[PDB]
mmCIF file of N, CA and C and ligand atoms in Angstrom:
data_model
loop_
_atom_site.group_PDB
_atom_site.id
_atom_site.type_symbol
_atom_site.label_atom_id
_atom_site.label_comp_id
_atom_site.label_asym_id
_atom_site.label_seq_id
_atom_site.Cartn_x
_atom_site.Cartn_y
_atom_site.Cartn_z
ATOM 1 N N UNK A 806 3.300 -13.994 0.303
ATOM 2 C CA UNK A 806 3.342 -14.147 -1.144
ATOM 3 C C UNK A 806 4.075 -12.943 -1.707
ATOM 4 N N UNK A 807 4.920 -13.088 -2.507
ATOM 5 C CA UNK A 807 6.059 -12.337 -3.370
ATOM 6 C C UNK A 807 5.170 -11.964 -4.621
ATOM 7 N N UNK A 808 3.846 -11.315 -5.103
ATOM 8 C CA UNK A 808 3.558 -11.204 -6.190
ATOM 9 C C UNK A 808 4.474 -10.435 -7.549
ATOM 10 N N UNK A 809 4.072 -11.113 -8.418
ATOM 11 C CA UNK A 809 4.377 -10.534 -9.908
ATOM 12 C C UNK A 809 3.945 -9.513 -10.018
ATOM 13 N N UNK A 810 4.633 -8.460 -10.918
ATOM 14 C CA UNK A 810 4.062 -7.125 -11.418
ATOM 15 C C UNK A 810 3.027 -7.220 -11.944
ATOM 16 N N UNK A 811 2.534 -7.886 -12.925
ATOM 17 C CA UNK A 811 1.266 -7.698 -14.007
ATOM 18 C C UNK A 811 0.390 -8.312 -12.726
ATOM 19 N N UNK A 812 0.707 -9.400 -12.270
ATOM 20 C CA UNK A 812 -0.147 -10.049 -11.151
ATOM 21 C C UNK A 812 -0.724 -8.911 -10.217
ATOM 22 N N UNK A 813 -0.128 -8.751 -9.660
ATOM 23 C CA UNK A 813 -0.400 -7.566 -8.837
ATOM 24 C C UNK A 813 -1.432 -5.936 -8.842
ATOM 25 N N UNK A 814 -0.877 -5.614 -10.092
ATOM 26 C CA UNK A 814 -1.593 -4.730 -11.253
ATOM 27 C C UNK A 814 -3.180 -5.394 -11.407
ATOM 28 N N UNK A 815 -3.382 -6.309 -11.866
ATOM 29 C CA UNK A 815 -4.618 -7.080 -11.971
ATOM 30 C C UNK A 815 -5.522 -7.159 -11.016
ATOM 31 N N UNK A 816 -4.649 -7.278 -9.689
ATOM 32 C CA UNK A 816 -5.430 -7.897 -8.770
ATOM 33 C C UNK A 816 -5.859 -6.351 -8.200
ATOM 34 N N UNK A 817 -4.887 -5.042 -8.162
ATOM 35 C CA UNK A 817 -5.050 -4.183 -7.539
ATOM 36 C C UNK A 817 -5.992 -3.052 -8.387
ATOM 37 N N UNK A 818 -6.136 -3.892 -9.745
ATOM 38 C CA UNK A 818 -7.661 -2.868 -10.575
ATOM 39 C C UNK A 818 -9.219 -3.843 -10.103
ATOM 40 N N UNK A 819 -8.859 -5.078 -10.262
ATOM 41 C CA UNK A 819 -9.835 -5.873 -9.636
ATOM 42 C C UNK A 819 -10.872 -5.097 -8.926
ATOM 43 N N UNK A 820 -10.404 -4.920 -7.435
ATOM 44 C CA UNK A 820 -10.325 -3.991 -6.265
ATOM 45 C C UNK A 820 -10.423 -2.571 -6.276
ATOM 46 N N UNK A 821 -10.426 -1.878 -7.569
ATOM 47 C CA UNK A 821 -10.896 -0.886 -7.863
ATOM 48 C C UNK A 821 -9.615 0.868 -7.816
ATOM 49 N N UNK A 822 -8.701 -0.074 -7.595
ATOM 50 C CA UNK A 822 -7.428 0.898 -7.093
ATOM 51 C C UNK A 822 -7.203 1.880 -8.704
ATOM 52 N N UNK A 823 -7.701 1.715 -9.975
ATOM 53 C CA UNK A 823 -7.257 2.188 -11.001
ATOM 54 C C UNK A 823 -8.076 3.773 -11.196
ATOM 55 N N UNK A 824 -7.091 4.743 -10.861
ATOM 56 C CA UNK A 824 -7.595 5.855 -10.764
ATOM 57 C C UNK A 824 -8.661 6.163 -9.629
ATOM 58 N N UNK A 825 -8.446 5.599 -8.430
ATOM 59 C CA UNK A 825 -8.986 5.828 -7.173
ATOM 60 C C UNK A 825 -8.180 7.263 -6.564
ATOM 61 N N UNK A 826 -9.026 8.054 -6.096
ATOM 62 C CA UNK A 826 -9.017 9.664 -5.790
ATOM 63 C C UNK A 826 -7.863 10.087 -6.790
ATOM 64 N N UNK A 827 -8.081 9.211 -8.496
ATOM 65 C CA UNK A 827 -7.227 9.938 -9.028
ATOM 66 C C UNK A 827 -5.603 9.695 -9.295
ATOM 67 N N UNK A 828 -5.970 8.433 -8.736
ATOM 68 C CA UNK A 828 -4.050 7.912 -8.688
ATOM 69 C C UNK A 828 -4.424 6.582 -9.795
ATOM 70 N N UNK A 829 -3.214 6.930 -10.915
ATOM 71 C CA UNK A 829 -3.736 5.662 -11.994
ATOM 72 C C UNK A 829 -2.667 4.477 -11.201
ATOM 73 N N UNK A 830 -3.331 3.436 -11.769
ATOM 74 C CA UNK A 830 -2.880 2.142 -11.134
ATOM 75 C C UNK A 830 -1.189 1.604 -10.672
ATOM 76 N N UNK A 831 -0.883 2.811 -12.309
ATOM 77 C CA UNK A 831 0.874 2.819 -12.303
ATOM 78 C C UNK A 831 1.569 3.284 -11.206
ATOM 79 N N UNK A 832 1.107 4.219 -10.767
ATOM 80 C CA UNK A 832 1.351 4.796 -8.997
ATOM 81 C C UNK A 832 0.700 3.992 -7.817
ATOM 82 N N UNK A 833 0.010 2.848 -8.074
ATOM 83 C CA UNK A 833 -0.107 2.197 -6.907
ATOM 84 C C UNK A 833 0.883 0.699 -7.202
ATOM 85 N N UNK A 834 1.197 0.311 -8.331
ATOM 86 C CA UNK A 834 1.692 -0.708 -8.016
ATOM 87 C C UNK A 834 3.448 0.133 -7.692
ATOM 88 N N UNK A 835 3.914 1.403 -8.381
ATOM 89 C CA UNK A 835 5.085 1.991 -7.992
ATOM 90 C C UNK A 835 5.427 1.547 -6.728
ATOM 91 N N UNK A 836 4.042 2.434 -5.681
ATOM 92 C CA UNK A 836 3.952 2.600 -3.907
ATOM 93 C C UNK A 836 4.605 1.147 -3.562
ATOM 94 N N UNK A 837 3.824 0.130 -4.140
ATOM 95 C CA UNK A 837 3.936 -1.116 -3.543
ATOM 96 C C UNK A 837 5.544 -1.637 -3.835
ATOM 97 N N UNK A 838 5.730 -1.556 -5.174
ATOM 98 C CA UNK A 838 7.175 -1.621 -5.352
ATOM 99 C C UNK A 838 8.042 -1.216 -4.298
ATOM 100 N N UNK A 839 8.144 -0.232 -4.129
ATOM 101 C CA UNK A 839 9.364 0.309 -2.838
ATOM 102 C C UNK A 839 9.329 0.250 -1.525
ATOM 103 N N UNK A 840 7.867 0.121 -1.275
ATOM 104 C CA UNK A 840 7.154 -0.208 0.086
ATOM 105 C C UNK A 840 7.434 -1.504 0.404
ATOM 106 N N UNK A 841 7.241 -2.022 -0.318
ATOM 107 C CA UNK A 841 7.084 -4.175 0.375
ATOM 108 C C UNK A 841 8.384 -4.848 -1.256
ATOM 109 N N UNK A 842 8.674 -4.036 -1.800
ATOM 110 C CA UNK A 842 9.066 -4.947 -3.356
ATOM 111 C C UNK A 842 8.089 -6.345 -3.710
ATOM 112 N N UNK A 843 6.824 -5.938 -3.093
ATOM 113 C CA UNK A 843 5.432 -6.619 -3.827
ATOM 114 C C UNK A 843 5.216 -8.281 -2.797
ATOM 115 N N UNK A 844 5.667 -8.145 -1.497
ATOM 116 C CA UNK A 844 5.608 -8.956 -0.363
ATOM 117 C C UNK A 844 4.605 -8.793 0.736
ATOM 118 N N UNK A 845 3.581 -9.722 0.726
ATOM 119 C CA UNK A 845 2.366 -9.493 1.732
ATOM 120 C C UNK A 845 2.605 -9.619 2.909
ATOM 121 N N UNK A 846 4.189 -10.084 3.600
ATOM 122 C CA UNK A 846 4.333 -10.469 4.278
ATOM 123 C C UNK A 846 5.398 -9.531 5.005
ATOM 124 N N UNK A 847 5.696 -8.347 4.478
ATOM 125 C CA UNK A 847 6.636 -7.454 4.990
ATOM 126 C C UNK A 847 5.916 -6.436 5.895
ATOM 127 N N UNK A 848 7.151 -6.528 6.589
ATOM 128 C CA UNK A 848 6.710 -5.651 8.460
ATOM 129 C C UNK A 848 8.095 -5.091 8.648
ATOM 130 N N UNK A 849 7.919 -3.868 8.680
ATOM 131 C CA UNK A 849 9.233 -2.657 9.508
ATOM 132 C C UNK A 849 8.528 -1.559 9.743
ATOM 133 N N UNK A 850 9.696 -1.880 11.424
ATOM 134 C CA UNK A 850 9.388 -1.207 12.168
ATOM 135 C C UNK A 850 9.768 0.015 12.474
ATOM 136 N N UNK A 851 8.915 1.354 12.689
ATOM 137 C CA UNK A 851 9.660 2.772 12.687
ATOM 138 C C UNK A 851 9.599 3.254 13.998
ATOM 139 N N UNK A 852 10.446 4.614 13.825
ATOM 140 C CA UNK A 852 10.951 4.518 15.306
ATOM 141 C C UNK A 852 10.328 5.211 16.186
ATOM 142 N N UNK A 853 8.848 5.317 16.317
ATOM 143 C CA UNK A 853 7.891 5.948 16.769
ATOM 144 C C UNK A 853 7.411 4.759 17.692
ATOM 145 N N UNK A 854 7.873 3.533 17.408
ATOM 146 C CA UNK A 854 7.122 2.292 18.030
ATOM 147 C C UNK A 854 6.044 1.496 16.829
ATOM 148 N N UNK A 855 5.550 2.341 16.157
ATOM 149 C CA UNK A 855 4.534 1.744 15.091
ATOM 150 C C UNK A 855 5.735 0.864 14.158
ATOM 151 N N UNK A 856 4.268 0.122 13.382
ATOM 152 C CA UNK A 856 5.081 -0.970 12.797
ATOM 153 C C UNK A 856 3.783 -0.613 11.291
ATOM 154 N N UNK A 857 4.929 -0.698 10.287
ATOM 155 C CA UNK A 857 4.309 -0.686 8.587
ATOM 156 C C UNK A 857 4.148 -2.329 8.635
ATOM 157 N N UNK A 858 2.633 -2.882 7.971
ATOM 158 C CA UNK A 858 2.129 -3.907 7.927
ATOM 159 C C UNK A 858 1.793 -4.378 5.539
ATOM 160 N N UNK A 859 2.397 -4.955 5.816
ATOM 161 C CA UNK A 859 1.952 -5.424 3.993
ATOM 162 C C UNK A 859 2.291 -5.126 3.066
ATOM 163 N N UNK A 860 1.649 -5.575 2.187
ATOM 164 C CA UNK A 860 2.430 -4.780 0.630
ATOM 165 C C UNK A 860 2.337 -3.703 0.262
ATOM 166 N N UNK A 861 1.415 -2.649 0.923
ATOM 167 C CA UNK A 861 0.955 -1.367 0.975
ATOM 168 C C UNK A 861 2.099 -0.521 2.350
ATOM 169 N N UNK A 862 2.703 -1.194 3.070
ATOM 170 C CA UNK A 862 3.063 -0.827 4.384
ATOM 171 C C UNK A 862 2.404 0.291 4.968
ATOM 172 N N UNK A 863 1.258 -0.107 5.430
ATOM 173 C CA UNK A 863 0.426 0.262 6.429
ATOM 174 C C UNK A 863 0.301 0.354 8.285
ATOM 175 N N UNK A 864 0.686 1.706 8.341
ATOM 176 C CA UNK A 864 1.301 1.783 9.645
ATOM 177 C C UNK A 864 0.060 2.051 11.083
ATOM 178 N N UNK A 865 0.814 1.253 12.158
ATOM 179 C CA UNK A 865 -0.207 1.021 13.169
ATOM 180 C C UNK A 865 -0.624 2.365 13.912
ATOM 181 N N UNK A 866 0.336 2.939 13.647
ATOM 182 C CA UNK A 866 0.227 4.256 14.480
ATOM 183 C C UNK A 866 -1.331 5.009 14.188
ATOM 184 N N UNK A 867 -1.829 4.748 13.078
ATOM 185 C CA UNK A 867 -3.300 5.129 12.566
ATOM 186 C C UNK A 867 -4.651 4.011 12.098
ATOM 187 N N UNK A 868 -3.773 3.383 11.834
ATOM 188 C CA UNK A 868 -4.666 2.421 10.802
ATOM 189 C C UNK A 868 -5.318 0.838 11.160
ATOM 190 N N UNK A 869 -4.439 0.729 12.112
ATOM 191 C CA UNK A 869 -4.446 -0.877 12.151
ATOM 192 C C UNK A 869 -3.916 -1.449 13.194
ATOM 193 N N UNK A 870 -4.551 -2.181 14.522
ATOM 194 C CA UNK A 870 -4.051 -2.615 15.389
ATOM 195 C C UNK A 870 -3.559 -3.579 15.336
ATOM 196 N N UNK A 871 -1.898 -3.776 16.400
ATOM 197 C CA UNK A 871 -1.183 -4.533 16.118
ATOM 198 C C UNK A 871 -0.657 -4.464 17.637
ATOM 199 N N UNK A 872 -1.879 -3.994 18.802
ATOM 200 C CA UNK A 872 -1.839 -4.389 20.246
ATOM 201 C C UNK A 872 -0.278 -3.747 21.025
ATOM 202 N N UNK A 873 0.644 -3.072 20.369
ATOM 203 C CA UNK A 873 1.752 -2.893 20.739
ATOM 204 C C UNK A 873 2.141 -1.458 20.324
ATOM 205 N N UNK A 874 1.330 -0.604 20.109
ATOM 206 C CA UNK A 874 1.501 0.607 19.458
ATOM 207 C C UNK A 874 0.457 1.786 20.560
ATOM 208 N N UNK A 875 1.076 1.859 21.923
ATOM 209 C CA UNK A 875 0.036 2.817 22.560
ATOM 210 C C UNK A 875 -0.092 4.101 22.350
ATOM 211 N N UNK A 876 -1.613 4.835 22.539
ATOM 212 C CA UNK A 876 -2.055 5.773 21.916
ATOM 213 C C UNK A 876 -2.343 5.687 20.553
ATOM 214 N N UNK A 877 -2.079 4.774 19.817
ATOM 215 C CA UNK A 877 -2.681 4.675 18.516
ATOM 216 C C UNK A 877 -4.126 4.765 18.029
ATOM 217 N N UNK A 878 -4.174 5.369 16.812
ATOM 218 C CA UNK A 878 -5.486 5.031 16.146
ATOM 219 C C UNK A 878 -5.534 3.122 15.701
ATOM 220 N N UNK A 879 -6.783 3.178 15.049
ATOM 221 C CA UNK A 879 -7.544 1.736 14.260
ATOM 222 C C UNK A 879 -8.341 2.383 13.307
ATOM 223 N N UNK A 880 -8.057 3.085 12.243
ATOM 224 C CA UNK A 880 -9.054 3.748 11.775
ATOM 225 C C UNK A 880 -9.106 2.928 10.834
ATOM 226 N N UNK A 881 -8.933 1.689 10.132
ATOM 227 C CA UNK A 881 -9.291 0.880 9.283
ATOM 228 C C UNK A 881 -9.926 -0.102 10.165
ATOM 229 N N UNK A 882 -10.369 -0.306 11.572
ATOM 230 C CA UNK A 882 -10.685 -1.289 12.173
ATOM 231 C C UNK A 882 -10.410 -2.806 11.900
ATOM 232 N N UNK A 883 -8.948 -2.792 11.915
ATOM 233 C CA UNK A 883 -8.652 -4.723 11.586
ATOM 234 C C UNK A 883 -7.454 -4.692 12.400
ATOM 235 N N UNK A 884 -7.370 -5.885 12.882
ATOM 236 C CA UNK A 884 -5.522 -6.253 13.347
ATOM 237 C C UNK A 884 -4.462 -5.938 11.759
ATOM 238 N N UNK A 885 -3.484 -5.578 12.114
ATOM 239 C CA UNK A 885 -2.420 -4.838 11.501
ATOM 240 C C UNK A 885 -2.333 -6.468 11.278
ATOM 241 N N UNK A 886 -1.561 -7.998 11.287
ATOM 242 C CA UNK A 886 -1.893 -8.908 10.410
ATOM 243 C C UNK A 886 -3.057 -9.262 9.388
ATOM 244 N N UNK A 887 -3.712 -9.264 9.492
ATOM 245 C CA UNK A 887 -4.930 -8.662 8.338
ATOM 246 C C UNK A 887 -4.686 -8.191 6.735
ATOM 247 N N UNK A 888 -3.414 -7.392 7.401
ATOM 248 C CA UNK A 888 -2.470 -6.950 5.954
ATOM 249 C C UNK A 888 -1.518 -7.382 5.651
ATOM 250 N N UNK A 889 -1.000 -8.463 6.162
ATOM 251 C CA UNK A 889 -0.387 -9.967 5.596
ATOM 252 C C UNK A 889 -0.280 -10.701 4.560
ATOM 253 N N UNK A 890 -2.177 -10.817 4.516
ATOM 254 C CA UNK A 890 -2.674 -12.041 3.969
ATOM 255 C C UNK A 890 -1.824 -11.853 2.459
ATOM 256 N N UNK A 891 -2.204 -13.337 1.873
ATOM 257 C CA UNK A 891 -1.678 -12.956 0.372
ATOM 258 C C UNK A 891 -3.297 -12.805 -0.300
ATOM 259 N N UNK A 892 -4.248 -12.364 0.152
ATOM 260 C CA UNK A 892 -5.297 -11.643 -0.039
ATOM 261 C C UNK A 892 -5.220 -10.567 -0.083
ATOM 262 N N UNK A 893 -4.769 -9.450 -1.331
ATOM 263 C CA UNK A 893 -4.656 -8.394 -0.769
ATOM 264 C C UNK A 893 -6.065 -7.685 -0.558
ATOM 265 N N UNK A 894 -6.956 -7.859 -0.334
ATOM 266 C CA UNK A 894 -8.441 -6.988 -0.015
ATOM 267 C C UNK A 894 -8.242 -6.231 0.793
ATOM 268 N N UNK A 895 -7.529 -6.909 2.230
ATOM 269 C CA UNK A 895 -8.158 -5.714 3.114
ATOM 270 C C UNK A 895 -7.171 -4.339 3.438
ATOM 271 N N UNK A 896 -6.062 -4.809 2.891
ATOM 272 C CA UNK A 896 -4.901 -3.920 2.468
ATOM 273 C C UNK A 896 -5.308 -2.646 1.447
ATOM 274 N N UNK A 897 -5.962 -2.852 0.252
ATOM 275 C CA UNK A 897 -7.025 -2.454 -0.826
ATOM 276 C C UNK A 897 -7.499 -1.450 -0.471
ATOM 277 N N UNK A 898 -8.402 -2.557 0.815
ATOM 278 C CA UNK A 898 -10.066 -1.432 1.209
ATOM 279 C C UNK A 898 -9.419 -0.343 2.338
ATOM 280 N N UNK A 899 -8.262 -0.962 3.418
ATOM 281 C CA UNK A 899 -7.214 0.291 3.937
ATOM 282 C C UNK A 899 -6.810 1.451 3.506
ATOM 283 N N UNK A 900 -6.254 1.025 2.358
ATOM 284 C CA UNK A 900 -5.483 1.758 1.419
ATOM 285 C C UNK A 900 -6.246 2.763 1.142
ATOM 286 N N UNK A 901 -7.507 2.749 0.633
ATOM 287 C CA UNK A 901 -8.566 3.554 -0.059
ATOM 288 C C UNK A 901 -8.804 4.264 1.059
ATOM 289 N N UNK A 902 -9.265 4.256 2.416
ATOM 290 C CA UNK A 902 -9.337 4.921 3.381
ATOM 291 C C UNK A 902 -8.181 6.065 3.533
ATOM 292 N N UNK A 903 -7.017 5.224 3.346
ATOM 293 C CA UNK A 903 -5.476 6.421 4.172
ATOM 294 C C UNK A 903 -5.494 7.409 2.797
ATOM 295 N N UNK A 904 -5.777 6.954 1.415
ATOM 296 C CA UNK A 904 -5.887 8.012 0.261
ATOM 297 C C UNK A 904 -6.803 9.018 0.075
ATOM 298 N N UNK A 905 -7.938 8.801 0.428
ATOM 299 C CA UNK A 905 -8.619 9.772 1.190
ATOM 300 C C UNK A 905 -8.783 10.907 2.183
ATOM 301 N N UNK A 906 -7.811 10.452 2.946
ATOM 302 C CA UNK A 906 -7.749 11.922 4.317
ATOM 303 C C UNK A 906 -7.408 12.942 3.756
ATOM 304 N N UNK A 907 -7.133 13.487 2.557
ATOM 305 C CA UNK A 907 -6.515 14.644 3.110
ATOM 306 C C UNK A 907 -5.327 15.056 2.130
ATOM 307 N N UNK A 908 -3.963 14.041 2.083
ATOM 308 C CA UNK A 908 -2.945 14.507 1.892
ATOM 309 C C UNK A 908 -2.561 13.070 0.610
ATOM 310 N N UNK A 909 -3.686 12.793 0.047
ATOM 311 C CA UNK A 909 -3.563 11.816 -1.264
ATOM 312 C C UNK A 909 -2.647 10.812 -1.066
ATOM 313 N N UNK A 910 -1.813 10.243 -2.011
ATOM 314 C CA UNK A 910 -0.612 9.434 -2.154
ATOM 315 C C UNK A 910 0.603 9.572 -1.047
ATOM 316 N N UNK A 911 0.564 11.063 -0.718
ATOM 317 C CA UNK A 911 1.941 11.440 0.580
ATOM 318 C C UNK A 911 1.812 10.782 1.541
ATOM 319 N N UNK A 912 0.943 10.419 1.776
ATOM 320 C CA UNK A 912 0.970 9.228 3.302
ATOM 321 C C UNK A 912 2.279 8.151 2.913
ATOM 322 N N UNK A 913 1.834 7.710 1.497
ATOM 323 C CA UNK A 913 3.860 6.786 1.650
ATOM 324 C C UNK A 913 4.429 7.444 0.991
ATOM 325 N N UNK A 914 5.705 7.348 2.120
ATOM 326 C CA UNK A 914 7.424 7.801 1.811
ATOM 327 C C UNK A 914 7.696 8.007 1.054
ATOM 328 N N UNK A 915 7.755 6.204 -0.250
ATOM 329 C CA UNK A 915 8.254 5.986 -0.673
ATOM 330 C C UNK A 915 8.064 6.182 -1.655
ATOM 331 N N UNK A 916 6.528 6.562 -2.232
ATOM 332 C CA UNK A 916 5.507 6.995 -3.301
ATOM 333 C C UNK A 916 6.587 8.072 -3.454
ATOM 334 N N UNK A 917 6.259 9.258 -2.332
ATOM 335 C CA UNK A 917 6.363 10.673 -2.569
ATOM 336 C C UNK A 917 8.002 10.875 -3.039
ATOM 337 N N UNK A 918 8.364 9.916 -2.694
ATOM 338 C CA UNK A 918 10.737 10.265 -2.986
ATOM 339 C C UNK A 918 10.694 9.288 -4.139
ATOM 340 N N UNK A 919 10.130 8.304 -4.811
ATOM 341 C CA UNK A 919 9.960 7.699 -5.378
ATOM 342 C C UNK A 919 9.647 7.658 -6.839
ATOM 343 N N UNK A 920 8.518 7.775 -6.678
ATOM 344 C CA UNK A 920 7.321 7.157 -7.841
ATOM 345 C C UNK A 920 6.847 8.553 -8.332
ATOM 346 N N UNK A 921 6.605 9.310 -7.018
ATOM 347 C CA UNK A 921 5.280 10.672 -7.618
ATOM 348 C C UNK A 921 6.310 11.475 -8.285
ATOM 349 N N UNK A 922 5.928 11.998 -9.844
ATOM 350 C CA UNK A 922 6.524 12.780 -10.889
ATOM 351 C C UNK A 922 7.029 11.994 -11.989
ATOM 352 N N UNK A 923 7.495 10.943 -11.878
ATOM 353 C CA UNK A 923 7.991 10.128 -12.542
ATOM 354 C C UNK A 923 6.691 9.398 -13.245
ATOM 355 N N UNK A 924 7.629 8.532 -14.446
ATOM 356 C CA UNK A 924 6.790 7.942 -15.490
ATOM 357 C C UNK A 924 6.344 6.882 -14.808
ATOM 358 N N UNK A 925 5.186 6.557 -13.807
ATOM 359 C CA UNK A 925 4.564 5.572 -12.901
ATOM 360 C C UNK A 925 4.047 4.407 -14.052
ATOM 361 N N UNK A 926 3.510 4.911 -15.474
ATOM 362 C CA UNK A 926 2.588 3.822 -16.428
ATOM 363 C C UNK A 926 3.633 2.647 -16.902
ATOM 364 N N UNK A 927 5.496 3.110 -16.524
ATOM 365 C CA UNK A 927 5.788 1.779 -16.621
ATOM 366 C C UNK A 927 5.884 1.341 -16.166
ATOM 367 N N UNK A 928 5.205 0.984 -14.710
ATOM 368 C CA UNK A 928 5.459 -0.328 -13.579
ATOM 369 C C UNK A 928 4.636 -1.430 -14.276
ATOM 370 N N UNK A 929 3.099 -0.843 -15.344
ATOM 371 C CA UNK A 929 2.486 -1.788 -15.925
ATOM 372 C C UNK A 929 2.588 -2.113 -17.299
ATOM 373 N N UNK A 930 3.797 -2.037 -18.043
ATOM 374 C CA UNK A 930 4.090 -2.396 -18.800
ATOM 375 C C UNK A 930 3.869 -3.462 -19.184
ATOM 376 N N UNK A 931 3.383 -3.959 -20.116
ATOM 377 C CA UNK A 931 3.134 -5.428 -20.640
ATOM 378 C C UNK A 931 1.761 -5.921 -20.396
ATOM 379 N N UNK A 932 1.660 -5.433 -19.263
ATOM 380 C CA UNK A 932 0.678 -6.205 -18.288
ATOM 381 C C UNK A 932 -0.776 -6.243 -19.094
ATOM 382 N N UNK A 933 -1.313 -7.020 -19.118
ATOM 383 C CA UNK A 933 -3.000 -7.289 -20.063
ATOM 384 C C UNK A 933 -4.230 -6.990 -18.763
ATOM 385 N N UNK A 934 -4.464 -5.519 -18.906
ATOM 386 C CA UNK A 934 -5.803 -4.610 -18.184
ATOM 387 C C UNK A 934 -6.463 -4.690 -18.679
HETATM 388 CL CL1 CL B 688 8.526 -15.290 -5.153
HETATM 389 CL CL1 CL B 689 6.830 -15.877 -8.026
HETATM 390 CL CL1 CL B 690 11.373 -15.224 -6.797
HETATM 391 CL CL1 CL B 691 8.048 -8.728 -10.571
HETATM 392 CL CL1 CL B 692 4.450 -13.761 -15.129
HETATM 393 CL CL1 CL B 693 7.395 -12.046 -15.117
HETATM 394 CL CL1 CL B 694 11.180 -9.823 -10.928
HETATM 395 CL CL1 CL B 695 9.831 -15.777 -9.643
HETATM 396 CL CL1 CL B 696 5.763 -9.499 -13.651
HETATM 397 CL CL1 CL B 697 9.187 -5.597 -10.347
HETATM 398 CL CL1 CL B 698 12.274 -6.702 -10.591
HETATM 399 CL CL1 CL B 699 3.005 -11.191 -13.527
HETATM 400 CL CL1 CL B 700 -8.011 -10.218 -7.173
HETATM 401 CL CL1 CL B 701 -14.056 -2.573 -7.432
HETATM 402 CL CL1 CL B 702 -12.246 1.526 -11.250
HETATM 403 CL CL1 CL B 703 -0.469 4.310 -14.822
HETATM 404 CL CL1 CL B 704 11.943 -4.364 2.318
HETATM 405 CL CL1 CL B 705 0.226 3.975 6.401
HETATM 406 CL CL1 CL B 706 -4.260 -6.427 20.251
HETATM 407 CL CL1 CL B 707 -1.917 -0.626 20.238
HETATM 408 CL CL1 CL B 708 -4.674 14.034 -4.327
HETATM 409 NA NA1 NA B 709 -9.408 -0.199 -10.787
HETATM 410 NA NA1 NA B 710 -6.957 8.603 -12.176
HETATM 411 NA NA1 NA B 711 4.346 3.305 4.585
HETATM 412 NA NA1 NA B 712 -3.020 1.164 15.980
HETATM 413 NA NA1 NA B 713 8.432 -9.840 -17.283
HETATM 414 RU RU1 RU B 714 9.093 -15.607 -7.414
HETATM 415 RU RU1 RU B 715 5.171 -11.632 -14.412
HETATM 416 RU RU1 RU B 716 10.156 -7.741 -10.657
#
């Protein structure tokens, strides 16, 4: 599923992502923007062997087994499809885990070259929160 911006936004305060360790919602739908361009179904692969899984691109190398990534962590305990679904929950409840360790939002790339500093509150423009 290709979600809509406001769609997306909605679904990802739902789930509790709005100002989770502090990141307002505008910086998570940013992440997702550049990460997946808002596709549950996007997978690339880096050159470590791990593979980024979802609209969050959530990588196997820590998070999520995907049986093809040796020496890896599972520290979200699910198969790396899991973060597929056009459910985004368990992507969500992932997410909230990798924002936590340690090093906040910098876990994605694309956040940190991206989104972080910049005016993030207009990814939800329009959108009815
Ligand atoms: Cl679409
Ligand atoms: Cl659509
Ligand atoms: Cl479309
Ligand atoms: Cl859109
Ligand atoms: Cl719409
Ligand atoms: Cl629209
Ligand atoms: Cl669009
Ligand atoms: Cl469309
Ligand atoms: Cl939209
Ligand atoms: Cl968009
Ligand atoms: Cl667009
Ligand atoms: Cl929308
Ligand atoms: Cl939802
Ligand atoms: Cl919640
Ligand atoms: Cl909340
Ligand atoms: Cl925001
Ligand atoms: Cl892409
Ligand atoms: Cl990740
Ligand atoms: Cl496996
Ligand atoms: Cl593995
Ligand atoms: Cl932080
Ligand atoms: Na929220
Ligand atoms: Na916040
Ligand atoms: Na990523
Ligand atoms: Na793994
Ligand atoms: Na629009
Ligand atoms: Ru469409
Ligand atoms: Ru829309
Ligand atoms: Ru768009």
């Amino acid at each position: 599923k290709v979600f809509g911006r406001c769609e997306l936004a909605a679904a990802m305060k739902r789930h509790g992502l709005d100002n989770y360790r502090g990141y307002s919602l505008g910086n998570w739908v940013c992440a997702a923007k550049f990460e997946s361009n808002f596709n549950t179904q996007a997978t690339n692969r880096n050159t470590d062997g791990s593979t980024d899984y979802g609209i969050l691109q959530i990588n196997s190398r820590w998070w999520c087994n995907d049986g093809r990534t040796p020496g890896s962590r599972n520290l979200c305990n699910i198969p790396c499809s899991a973060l597929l679904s056009s459910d985004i929950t368990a992507s969500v409840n992932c997410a909230k885990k990798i924002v936590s360790d340690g090093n906040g939002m910098n876990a994605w790339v694309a956040w940190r070259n991206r989104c972080k500093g910049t005016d993030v509150q207009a990814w939800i423009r329009g959108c009815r929160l």
